[PDB]
DNA sequence: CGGTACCCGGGCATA
DNA sequence: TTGATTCATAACCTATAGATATGCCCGGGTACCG
RNA sequence: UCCGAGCCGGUAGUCGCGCGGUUCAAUCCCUGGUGCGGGUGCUAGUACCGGCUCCGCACUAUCUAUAGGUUAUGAA
């Protein structure tokens, strides 16, 4: 449920023109960012130093104690046995790490809220990493050990001999996940590679469940897998394969948004005593520093401000909190045909790397939202160029290029990395302290919002005030094919949902191999013509590319006697849009998806 | 000079 | 869908988790008394 | 290491066509849009009325930190 929402507005328009409050909040957020960064680094340092014997169990108390020790040192006096024990255990190396990195103790006062937020965020990052990239990383390690790439490149494809190996590995996956109990003969029959992989997997001491797979165990108790993940990272480093970040480190020196609440407000911004704060209403207390009459603070869908924002000094995130807060396959068009039937107009979109949205309707009014247009309107390319120019002028790129890997588990290498970072820490901090980096983020947000609004307005003008959007199911989410730029595929669903425009998915399978004029796939031609590579550096290198967005039909019926080409040329995006139109018409007419596009 | 008791602000804990 | 190994700093995207307030005490100062 | 969109043709619903011609749109500064009125500012010939610009009435628009893949750059 949408219990929370945010209206991101500018810093100038969010707060009243009082320099004292602005300076106080800027200083506070800077201090909290420094504390979070150094706390993540100290946690990594402690884990690597104590890894000589065993991996310590990391809990909320551990990170909280690390943060408190960094801020105050031994002056922190926890009143609970667990926190006291954590402080006693973690104290010895905190000062050593601070001296190594020259970390001067800030001894910030009234850090309760900020330390709690940072500890919660760090534990969240740990849990998210463990959940997301444990199973995936383990399977990646298994495949790397099996050398699946080598077998694929060397062994014949689509053959029973290698289908046998594929089935063998698929069945062994269940044994690795403990879903299927292996027999003694099954274990004996394992080849040396399979036996070694099974033994190494068991060395991680992975948890187990009686009636559920390993993924269910990860979902239920993800935190228990942290030692296994660390050992897997160590194995990755030992074997020489590319390393991965097991412990999340907040290495970015750019100013980061810091939560600011009413307590922080009256402790640092207003600097009034807790006694006086309780005597004033929250809205009245906030009006002294924020213009609540501003549009950004208006209530939407029953949600109110309730005094909670995160600011980075340039853009202010104003969060609207619903009164009911916690107090601290169905999207496909096949299942949404009635909505399309009652829609005033139906528009089908075929996502692509370049043509992010290629739109068409029954009336034939074509519309597209290309990647180049998005780059121009958002300004990502211009901002990247300016950032590169600034880095070259300041020489920051040279400094950063020599920073060792943060993902290494080696203690001495990590110490050298920390020393290198400290060598030019001041220069990079000063460079990234420039307002452009935050102002760049704020301007990127504004440009993206304006581009989305313009896209919606153009679509409404072309197709009408009310219309329904049908989009292909293809989505390069998470993964991204190498040598290809990132593209927005799944965010358009959210964008259309925000603008109260229906967004229904559709299967793109074999939607670029059918000619609409004859509804046949035999005569469709692909990659028939060659031309120099469109990418300038490849073109200079002399490479040649095959056209993918151009398709033609060899069917004589589609041709005309006067033509000399011998084929009816087509646009890949246009073909996909026409095929989607035909599929949607068939579905709405009740005939279902055409048999030509149907799967095997 | 020496000792007792109350209030305020902040530190620390927990839902 | 569309192109043909290791590291760091940005970005784009995608996914995950979290998105504040009240109470106890303690010690340091002050008022009061002997 | 580069790139806006629309229209007219070579095209016949064709190409990262570094194919030709033509129209307006953005490069700084800016949270965005939607319906109402006013104030008068600019846009058109005598209330006809569309458009751009501000004012304020109310409906709507979730961000943050981290990891992964990729891109740009700097190193290998
Ligand atoms: Mg598609
Ligand atoms: Mg396509
Ligand atoms: Zn055909």
CB proximity A129–strand D (7 Å threshold): yes
Q: A355: which 2 tokens?
A: 């043509």
CA distances from residue A587 to A141, A336, A472, A508, A591 in whole angstroms, order as listed? 44, 10, 15, 15, 6
DSSP result, A470-527: EEES----S---TTS----SSHHHHHHHHTT--EEEE--TT-SS-BTTTTBSTTEEES
- Are A83 and A62 in contact by the 8 Å Cβ rule? The answer is no
Q: What is the resolution of this structure in A?
A: 2.7
Binding-site entries of A for Mg(2+):
350, 352, 508, 573
Q: A92: which 2 tokens?
A: 């010895």
CB proximity A536–strand D (7 Å threshold): yes
Please name the residue ranges forming H helices in A357-434: 371-378, 380-394, 396-401, 411-423, 425-432
> Which of A184, A177, A111 lies closest to A139 in space, CA to CA?
A177
Name residue A359's beta-bridge partners: A349, A367
By what technique were these coordinates determined?
cryo-EM
Helix/strand/coil for A160: helix
DSSP result, A423-483: HTHHHHHHHHTSHHHHHHHHHHHHHHHHHHHHHHHHHHHHH-SS-EEEEES----S---TT
Question: Which domains, ranges and CATH numbers included, belong to chain A?
Answer: 1-14+257-328 (no CATH), 17-133 (no CATH), 136-239 (no CATH), 343-370+449-506 (3.30.420), 524-589 (no CATH)
Burial of A275 (0-12, 13-18, 19+ CB in 10 A): exposed
Report how far residue A358's alpha carbon sits from residue A376's, in angstroms, rounded to the nearest whole number.
Answer: 17
Residues 6+ apart with CB under 8 A from A530: A544, A545, A546, A547
Count Cβ neighbours within 10 Å for each residue of A187-197 and write b for 16 or more, e otherwise. eeebeeebeeb
Question: For residue A356, how far is its CA from the centre of ligand 2 (angstroms)?
Answer: 9
Binding-site entries of A for Zn(2+):
515, 518, 553, 558
Report how far residue A148's alpha carbon sits from residue A84's, in angstroms, rounded to the nearest whole number.
Answer: 50
Report how far residue A33's alpha carbon sits from residue A545's, in angstroms, rounded to the nearest whole number.
Answer: 47
Strand C nucleotides within a 7 Å radius of protein CB atoms: 1-22, 26
CB proximity A154–strand B (7 Å threshold): no
Report how far residue A290's alpha carbon sits from residue A97's, in angstroms, rounded to the nearest whole number.
Answer: 40
**CA-based R_g, chain A, Å:** 29
> Which of A94, A116, A112 lies closest to A103 in space, CA to CA?
A94
Burial of A2 (0-12, 13-18, 19+ CB in 10 A): exposed
- Are A311 and A25 in contact by the 8 Å Cβ rule? The answer is yes
- Are A239 and A30 in contact by the 8 Å Cβ rule? The answer is no
Distance A367 CA to D6 C1' (A): 10
Residue A163 backbone dihedrals phi, psi, to 5 degrees: -60, -35
Query: Which nt sits closest to A2, CA to C1'?
Result: D62
Report how far residue A440's alpha carbon sits from residue A436's, in angstroms, rounded to the nearest whole number.
Answer: 5
Strands A367-369 and A308-311, sheet pairing: unpaired
Residue with tokens 């009014």: A365
Strands A315-321 and A4-10, sheet pairing: antiparallel
- Closest residue by Cα to the C1' atom of nucleotide D4? A373
H-run or E-run covering A192 = helix A192-202
Distance A77 CA to B4 C1' (A): 28
Burial of A1 (0-12, 13-18, 19+ CB in 10 A): exposed
- Are A47 and A55 in contact by the 8 Å Cβ rule? The answer is yes
Check the CA dihedral A31-A37-A43-A45 and report its sign. Answer: negative
Distance A263 CA to D70 C1' (A): 41
Crossing angle for the helix pair A19-50 and A112-133, to the nearest 10 degrees: 50
CB proximity A76–strand B (7 Å threshold): yes
Helix/strand/coil for A4: strand
Report how far residue A236's alpha carbon sits from residue A578's, in angstroms, rounded to the nearest whole number.
Answer: 48
Burial of A444 (0-12, 13-18, 19+ CB in 10 A): middle
- Are A463 and A347 in contact by the 8 Å Cβ rule? The answer is yes
Name residue A531's beta-bridge partners: A545
Work out the end-to-end distance of chain A between its first and last CA atoms, rounded to an integer number of angstroms: 39
Distance A291 CA to D59 C1' (A): 21
């Amino acid at each position: 449920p949408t219990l929370h929402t945010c209206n991101k507005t500018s810093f100038a328009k969010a707060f009243l023109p009082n320099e004292t409050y602005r300076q106080r909040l800027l200083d506070y957020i800077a201090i909290i960012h420094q504390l979070a960064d150094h706390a993540s680094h100290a946690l990594k340092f402690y884990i690597l130093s104590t890894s000589t014997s065993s991996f310590p169990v990391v809990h909320e108390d551990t990170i909280e104690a690390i943060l408190y020790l960094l801020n105050k040192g031994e002056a922190w006096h926890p009143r609970k046995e667990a926190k006291k024990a954590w402080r006693d255990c973690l104290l010895p190396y905190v000062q050593r790490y601070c001296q190594i990195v020259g970390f001067i103790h800030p001894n910030l006062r009234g850090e309760q809220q900020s330390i709690n937020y940072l500890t919660v965020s760090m534990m969240t990052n740990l849990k998210v990493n463990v959940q997301e990239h444990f199973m995936q990383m383990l399977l990646r390690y298994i495949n790397l050990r099996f050398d699946v790439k080598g077998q694929k490149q060397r062994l014949p494809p689509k053959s029973d001999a290698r289908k046998a190996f594929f089935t063998r590995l698929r069945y062994l996956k269940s044994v690795f996940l403990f879903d299927v109990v292996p027999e003694l003969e099954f274990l004996d029959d394992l080849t040396p590679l399979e036996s070694e992989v099974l033994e190494e997997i068991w060395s991680l001491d992975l948890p187990f469940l009686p009636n559920d797979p390993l993924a269910y165990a990860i979902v239920a108790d993800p935190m228990s897998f942290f030692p296994a993940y660390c050992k897997l990272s160590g194995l990755y480093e030992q074997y020489g394969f590319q390393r991965f970040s097991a412990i999340p480190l907040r290495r970015s020196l750019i100013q980061s948004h810091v939560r600011i609440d009413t307590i922080i407000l009256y402790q640092h911004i207003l600097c009034i005593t807790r006694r006086d704060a309780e005597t004033v209403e929250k809205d009245d207390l906030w009006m002294r520093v924020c213009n609540l009459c501003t549009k950004a603070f208006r209530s939407r869908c029953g949600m109110h401000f309730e005094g909670s924002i995160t600011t980075d000094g340039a853009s202010v995130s104003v969060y609207l909190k619903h009164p009911e807060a916690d107090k601290y396959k169905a999207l496909y068009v096949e299942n949404n045909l009635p909505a399309c039937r009652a829609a005033e107009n139906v528009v089908v979109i075929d996502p692509n790397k370049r043509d992010i949205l290629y739109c068409q309707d029954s009336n034939g009014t074509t519309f597209r939202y290309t990647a180049n247009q998005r780059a121009v309107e958002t300004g990502s390319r211009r901002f990247a160029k300016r950032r590169e120019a600034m880095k070259e002028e300041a020489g920051v790129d040279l400094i950063e290029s020599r920073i060792p890997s943060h993902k290494t588990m080696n203690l001495m290498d990590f110490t050298r990395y920390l020393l290198v970072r400290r060598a030019d820490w001041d220069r990079r901090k000063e460079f990234y302290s420039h307002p452009a980096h935050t102002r760049w983020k704020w301007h990127s947000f504004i440009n993206r919002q304006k581009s989305e609004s313009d896209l919606i307005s153009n679509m409404r003008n072309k197709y009408g005030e009310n219309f329904t959007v049908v989009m292909g199911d293809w989505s390069d989410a998470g993964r991204t094919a190498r040598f290809q730029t990132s593209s927005k595929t799944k965010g358009w669903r959210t964008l259309f949902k925000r603008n109260r425009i229906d967004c229904f998915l559709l299967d793109e399978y074999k939607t670029s191999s059918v000619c609409p004029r004859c509804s046949s796939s035999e005569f469709v031609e692909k990659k028939f013509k060659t031309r120099p590579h469109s990418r300038p550096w490849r073109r200079r290198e002399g490479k040649i590319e095959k056209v993918h967005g151009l398709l033609g039909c060899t069917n004589p019926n589609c041709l005309q006697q006067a033509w000399t080409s011998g084929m009816r040329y087509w646009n890949r995006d246009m073909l996909s849009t026409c095929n989607m139109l035909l599929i949607v018409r068939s579905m709405l007419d009740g005939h279902g998806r055409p048999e030509v596009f149907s799967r095997s």
